[PDB]
Structure formats: C-alpha cells, structure tokens
C-alpha cells in the first residue's frame, strides 16, 4: 500500500478540533483522530469509506 498510509495521524499546528479518519496500518483498520484544521497530510480523510477505498 502507499507510504502515507503507514504514517501516524498528523494533528498539525492549528488549534481547531476537527474529527478526521486515518488508516491505522498496524491494527489494519480505519479510526478517528483530532485534526487541527490546517496543513493536513495525506493520511487524513473526511469519511471512513473514503479512507478504506484509498488505504484498504
């Protein structure tokens, strides 16, 4: 699978509280984390199904 799928979730420097989905490579599943609102990385999705379709 893509490299960005193996990277841990990136909250970023912004201080908003936005729930986003990411692919948890080890556990091999899609979960949620707190995104700050800016400078998002690729392992950041607005929906679970969108995460699985890309990192599945």
């Amino acid at each position: 699978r893509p490299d960005f799928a193996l990277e841990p979730p990136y909250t970023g420097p912004c201080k908003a509280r936005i729930i986003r989905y990411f692919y948890n490579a080890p556990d091999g599943l899609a979960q949620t984390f707190v995104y700050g609102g800016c400078r998002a990385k690729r392992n950041n999705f607005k929906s679970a199904e969108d995460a699985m379709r890309t990192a599945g």
Partner: protein, 223 residues
Amino acid sequence: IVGGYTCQENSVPYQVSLNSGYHFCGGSLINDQWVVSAAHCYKSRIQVRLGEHNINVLEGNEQFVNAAKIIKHPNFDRKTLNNDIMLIKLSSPVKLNARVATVALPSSCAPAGTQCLISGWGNTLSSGVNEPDLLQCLDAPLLPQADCEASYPGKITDNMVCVGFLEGGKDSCQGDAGGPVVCNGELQGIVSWGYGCALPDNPGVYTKVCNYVDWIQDTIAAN
C-alpha cells in the same frame, strides 16, 4: 486550555462555541449580530452557541443561533496562517444579558508584558486527549515579538503575537482556536496556532486583532 482553571460560571460572557454537530472552535461576540473567530475554523454551515458554561448539558441560559454569513479575511493564507481572522454574522440578533455580552475591540495594540485572559473548551493535556465539559480559563502575558520570532524562526508575521510562557506548561490547545485573548477589557488576540501544546520554547501564536479593527468595522457596516 492546558494548565488553566475552570472559569467562574458565566464570567466570560463574550465567549461562544462554534458547533456543526459538535464543538470545534471558539469565538467572541463583538456586537449583537457579529462574532469574530479564526479563518481556519471555516465551515460552510455553523451554529453559534452563546451563554455556554457546560458544553454538554442544557443549562437553560444558552442561545443557539445559526450563522447567516461567514466572511474570512481576503488575505488569509492556509499555509502560513497569516491573517487568520473571520467574521460571522448571526441569522438574528442575540439577546444581551448577564450571561451573554460583547467584548470591546482594541483601542490600540497592547504592549508586551500585558496580562491577558484566554478561554476555551479545548484539550487540557499536552500529551493525550481530555476534553472538558466546563469552560477553561488561563491568565497569560503577551510576549515580546523578539521571543516569539526566536521560538518560531521565520514563521511569525506582523499580524501575529505570542501569548503564554516560554517554559511551557500553560497554553491554548486543539478546540480553543478562534477563541478570545482579552487584555484590560479589549480583544487583543484570537487563538490560532502553535507547535504542540504547552511545550517549552513553543508558546501559542495568536492573530493580532489590533491590526484588523478597520477591516472589521468596514465589513460589518457593508453587510
């Protein structure tokens, strides 16, 4: 807010919570129909909650009002966060009382060393996640621009100001963005960004509101 204290119920009447299903940012009421927040808190649909203390329990003093217009600063930069300010016009004027009040815009730019009050419902831990039910408060000073620049080499613009402590331990965090930094009764800053939360040598960075008073007033008058 990391390392702060629970605010006295309704002691920060100008604080608002931005909600689109859940609390995601703070804001400040500046007049009966307008709220100021951070541009990175932009959402196509936003509900503003005023008169809040415990964000997860209906207390009876709250007012729920939808945003009618959302206006980000035209020069907002999503990468550098320069000009991280946004205005929200409410669908209808709110009722001003002891629990819901406005905060004054700055008369001038406050000098470094000025003690201020920061508030919000953001994360309270530097490591891990702990979202508070009750509004949190933090007394912190405006830092000298030189120390701000030294903490964030080449990342600080004239539209930003650092507030907090270089030793870390106390700071704003995720969930606090858009929130107020009030010094001597005037809104001097808007919670914007920072590297981590409450980490040494990385104090929070805030939008310097005194540089936008004219933009705010002109925008409100034209909308």
